[PDB]
């Protein structure tokens, strides 16, 4: 793929892992809030660099408030450093669709439209996601999605509308727009390209994009005018949207306002019927 404070006491962990990886691991558990318990997902560090990513990440989530954006609870220093987030019970979109091949097309339009609303709100909030991928969209129900995974995300300086990475740390290049690859500039619009790839994954029931290919070759294919083909079952109007998200010229590519609305209407055309 890749080429605030809390009483540790008020919090139980389970030997039930919700993904993991480089940093450490994510685990299930729950937190005693005001009256009740909240079921939670907790990102734990395997322990210097990691601990500032986590704080930047928490500080980003701290700032975001939207129904299609996963909610931070807070953080906790104990045997390890931990980020505590409200649990999306059904989990990753890609792994869901992989396991439930018979989820109806209308259902898929519903879920991607929701991501689009999440992203429309980020764009308006002047944050860039920088990891927008099926693997990081989480299902609360079959019919309710939230965006997760803000480990690479960034609040945009007030003078600029892009973030300039300096050093390519390990990057999900198959989701990255050409400007990210060439000029390391990441914007709302870059995330639109990622949304395009995310849409493609969704309608392919969670198949990996550009299968069989390296970022080397993907990057050659995109430069050669070439894009991924329409997935079995996808509606024409939706493959038109994917493609529009894959506009090479950042200037000419649609923003999240536009994408959100276009999806809104198509869903409502499908719903009404
Ligand atoms: C914030 C962060 C994360 C970790 C996320 C952050 C984004 O990257 C992935 C980790 N999660 N994970 C959840 N809920 C959840 C439920 C079940 C699974 C699950 N169950 C497997 C069972 C076997 O077949 C595959 C899925 N895997 N992950 C899951 C996550 N909710 C959240 C909220």
Numbering used by the authors: 347 to 349, 363 to 406, 411 to 636
Structure paper excerpt:
Syk binds to and is activated by immunoreceptors Fc-epsilon (FcεR), Fc-gamma (FcγR), or the B-cell receptor (BCR) in the appropriate cellular context. Syk therefore has a central role in antibody-dependent immune cell activation and may mediate, at least in part, the pathophysiological mechanisms that underlie numerous instances of autoimmune disease.
Structure-based guided optimization of a triazolopyridine screening hit led to the identification of CC-509, an active and reversible inhibitor of Syk enzyme with an IC50 value = 0.026 +/- 0.006 μM (n = 8) and a Ki of 18 nM. Based on enzyme kinetics, CC-509 is a mixed competitive inhibitor with respect to the Syk ATP binding site. Consistent with this mode of inhibition, the co-crystal structure of CC-509 in Syk shows the inhibitor bound primarily in the ATP binding pocket via two hydrogen bonds with hinge residue Alanine 451. Based on its activity in this panel of kinases, the calculated Gini score (a metric for kinase selectivity) of 0.53 for CC-509 indicates the compound is considered moderately selective. For comparison, R406 also blocked Y525/526 phosphorylation at comparable potency (IC50 value = 0.72 ± 0.66 μM). This data indicate CC-509 is a cell-permeable and potent inhibitor of cellular Syk kinase activity. CC-509 inhibits FcεR-, FcγR-, and BCR-mediated signaling in disease-relevant and primary cell types. Importantly, CC-509 was successfully optimized to improve overall kinase selectivity and activity against KDR and Jak, and has a clearly differentiated profile when compared to R406. In conclusion, we describe a novel triazolopyridine-based Syk kinase inhibitor, CC-509, with potent cellular activity in FcR-dependent systems, favorable PK properties, and efficacy in models of inflammatory disease and arthritis.
